[PDB]
Design an enzyme around this catalytic site. Structure first.
Site, PDB file in Angstrom:
ATOM      1  N   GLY A  61      43.894  39.166  37.742  1.00 17.23           N
ATOM      2  CA  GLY A  61      43.069  37.972  37.817  1.00 17.23           C
ATOM      3  C   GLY A  61      43.688  37.007  38.811  1.00 17.23           C
ATOM      4  O   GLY A  61      44.519  37.414  39.627  1.00 17.23           O
ATOM      5  N   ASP A  95      33.860  29.607  38.681  1.00 15.45           N
ATOM      6  CA  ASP A  95      34.379  30.666  39.554  1.00 15.45           C
ATOM      7  C   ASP A  95      33.614  31.975  39.369  1.00 15.45           C
ATOM      8  O   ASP A  95      34.190  33.060  39.395  1.00 15.45           O
ATOM      9  CB  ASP A  95      35.872  30.898  39.292  1.00 15.45           C
ATOM     10  N   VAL A 146      45.932  43.010  35.071  1.00 13.77           N
ATOM     11  CA  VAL A 146      45.040  43.652  34.122  1.00 13.77           C
ATOM     12  C   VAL A 146      45.395  45.113  33.889  1.00 13.77           C
ATOM     13  O   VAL A 146      45.588  45.875  34.836  1.00 13.77           O
ATOM     14  CB  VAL A 146      43.576  43.541  34.605  1.00 13.77           C
ATOM     15  N   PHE A 175      45.621  34.855  38.049  1.00 18.23           N
ATOM     16  CA  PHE A 175      46.975  34.906  37.516  1.00 18.23           C
ATOM     17  C   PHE A 175      46.897  35.989  36.447  1.00 18.23           C
ATOM     18  O   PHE A 175      45.914  36.064  35.710  1.00 18.23           O
ATOM     19  CB  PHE A 175      47.366  33.574  36.876  1.00 18.23           C
ATOM     20  N   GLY A 176      47.909  36.843  36.375  1.00 22.25           N
ATOM     21  CA  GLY A 176      47.882  37.890  35.372  1.00 22.25           C
ATOM     22  C   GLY A 176      47.457  39.244  35.901  1.00 22.25           C
ATOM     23  O   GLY A 176      46.582  39.353  36.763  1.00 22.25           O
ATOM     24  N   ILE A 206      44.762  48.299  36.046  1.00 18.69           N
ATOM     25  CA  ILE A 206      43.383  48.318  36.525  1.00 18.69           C
ATOM     26  C   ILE A 206      42.920  47.091  37.298  1.00 18.69           C
ATOM     27  O   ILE A 206      41.727  46.948  37.569  1.00 18.69           O
ATOM     28  CB  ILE A 206      42.390  48.552  35.362  1.00 18.69           C
TER      29      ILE A 206
HETATM   30  C1  LIG Z   1      40.661  37.497  28.747  1.00 19.18           C
HETATM   31  C2  LIG Z   1      40.864  38.821  29.431  1.00 19.18           C
HETATM   32  C3  LIG Z   1      41.427  39.913  28.726  1.00 19.18           C
HETATM   33  C4  LIG Z   1      41.591  41.137  29.415  1.00 19.18           C
HETATM   34  C5  LIG Z   1      41.206  41.263  30.760  1.00 19.18           C
HETATM   35  C6  LIG Z   1      40.648  40.141  31.420  1.00 19.18           C
HETATM   36  C7  LIG Z   1      40.223  40.208  32.838  1.00 19.18           C
HETATM   37  N1  LIG Z   1      39.840  41.413  33.319  1.00 19.18           N
HETATM   38  C8  LIG Z   1      39.443  41.524  34.621  1.00 19.18           C
HETATM   39  N2  LIG Z   1      39.067  42.823  35.038  1.00 19.18           N
HETATM   40  C9  LIG Z   1      38.668  44.003  34.357  1.00 19.18           C
HETATM   41  C10 LIG Z   1      38.636  45.241  35.078  1.00 19.18           C
HETATM   42  C11 LIG Z   1      38.237  46.465  34.464  1.00 19.18           C
HETATM   43  C12 LIG Z   1      37.867  46.406  33.087  1.00 19.18           C
HETATM   44  N3  LIG Z   1      37.440  47.375  32.212  1.00 19.18           N
HETATM   45  N4  LIG Z   1      37.184  46.907  30.958  1.00 19.18           N
HETATM   46  C13 LIG Z   1      37.458  45.591  31.041  1.00 19.18           C
HETATM   47  C14 LIG Z   1      37.887  45.209  32.334  1.00 19.18           C
HETATM   48  C15 LIG Z   1      38.292  43.991  32.975  1.00 19.18           C
HETATM   49  C16 LIG Z   1      39.417  40.402  35.500  1.00 19.18           C
HETATM   50  C17 LIG Z   1      39.017  40.407  36.887  1.00 19.18           C
HETATM   51  C18 LIG Z   1      39.039  39.218  37.650  1.00 19.18           C
HETATM   52  C19 LIG Z   1      39.462  38.009  37.048  1.00 19.18           C
HETATM   53  C20 LIG Z   1      39.866  37.993  35.665  1.00 19.18           C
HETATM   54  C21 LIG Z   1      39.847  39.164  34.887  1.00 19.18           C
HETATM   55  N5  LIG Z   1      40.241  39.070  33.588  1.00 19.18           N
HETATM   56  N6  LIG Z   1      40.478  38.927  30.760  1.00 19.18           N
END
Ligand SMILES: Cc1cccc(-c2nc(Nc3ccc4[nH]ncc4c3)c3ccccc3n2)n1
Length: 285
Positions: free
Chosen positions: A14, A130, A19, A16-17, A11
């Site tokens: 980030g 950020d 999702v 880094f990383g 989905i």
């Molecule tokens: C600490 C953590 C755990 C899990 C995900 C993220 C995360 N998630 C992003 N996006 C995102 C997109 C759709 C979603 N639906 N429910 C939750 C969710 C999260 C991020 C996007 C940009 C930068 C960092 C992100 N970190 N950070």
């Protein structure tokens, strides 16, 4: 934790990383071993005492998962179907009440982050560094919660000490021209305010008659702008996102907030708490 989570759909990603939407529904961000420092630091910020708040992404856990060939570094959080505010605003327009709810919740979350909570189980003041519509998430009840705290800085008030990165487009003027004092925590707080102002601009455009969705400075800089490209517009030409002519009282209040978030000097900007108060009053009216 990670042992019992089944990934289902990619989905996003980030800085880094990657999702993923998994089932434990939860959101999972996976880092490789070479990204340990980024993984650890964000895990560290999320584990800060008394950080939990309705407008801060709910953190579940940090874990490791060995698939037999390599080890994955995991961060797990709540799952919100709407995803980012960016996606939400692109897909929908909002009512006056909906706009207020999105803006107030974001301000409430930033105020919580910025606010030091004194006590035995106290919370240090935290600056995001950020903030953008792409890392703010929209919950099912129409309120926002702030995500990606990996670049955050924590403040030790007893010594006034902390423990060029960031998204170019949202960088504060002082960050763009490097005049910001890296040793002054309050400066980072003020820089967050500038960014939240741009976010408020993105939301207000979608308040419906309405404007189409656009990133701030969409008509002044190219996509994925560099520091120099941003600096010339924000610092030298001294421009800010354009404020539409049409007006509604709620929109008038929002616009004023925006302007007061965009001063070149961080010390002149409004605080998150003041913004929350003002937005709270408007919500009551
Ligand atoms: C600490 C953590 C755990 C899990 C995900 C993220 C995360 N998630 C992003 N996006 C995102 C997109 C759709 C979603 N639906 N429910 C939750 C969710 C999260 C991020 C996007 C940009 C930068 C960092 C992100 N970190 N950070």
């Amino acid at each position: 934790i990670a042992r019992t989570i089944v990934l289902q759909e990619s989905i996003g990603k980030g800085r880094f990383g990657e999702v993923w939407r998994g089932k434990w529904e939860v959101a999972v961000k996976i880092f490789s071993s070479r990204e340990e420092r980024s993984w650890f630091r964000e895990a560290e910020i999320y584990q800060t005492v008394m950080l939990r708040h309705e407008n801060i992404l709910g953190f579940i856990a940090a874990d490791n998962k060995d698939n037999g060939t390599w080890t994955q570094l995991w961060l797990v959080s709540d799952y919100h179907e709407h995803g980012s505010l960016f996606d939400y605003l692109n897909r929908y327009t909002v009512t006056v009440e909906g706009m207020i709810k999105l803006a107030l919740s974001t301000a409430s979350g930033l105020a919580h982050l910025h606010m030091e909570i004194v006590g035995t189980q106290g919370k240090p003041a935290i600056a995001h560094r950020d903030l953008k519509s792409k890392n703010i998430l929209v919950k099912k009840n129409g309120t926002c919660c702030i995500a990606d705290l990996g670049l955050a800085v924590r403040h030790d008030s007893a010594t006034d000490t902390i423990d060029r990165v960031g998204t170019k487009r949202y960088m504060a003027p002082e960050v763009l021209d490097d005049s910001i004092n890296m040793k002054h925590f309050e400066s980072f707080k003020r820089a967050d305010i500038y960014a939240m102002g741009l976010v408020f601009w993105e939301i207000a455009r979608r308040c419906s008659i309405h404007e189409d969705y656009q990133l701030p400075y969409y008509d002044l800089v190219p996509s994925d702008p560099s520091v120099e490209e941003m600096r010339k517009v924000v610092c030298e030409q001294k421009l800010r996102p354009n404020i539409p002519n049409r007006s509604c009282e709620a929109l008038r209040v929002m616009a004023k907030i925006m302007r007061e978030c965009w001063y070149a000097n961080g010390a002149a900007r409004l605080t998150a708490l003041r913004i929350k108060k003002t937005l709270s009053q408007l919500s009551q009216q």
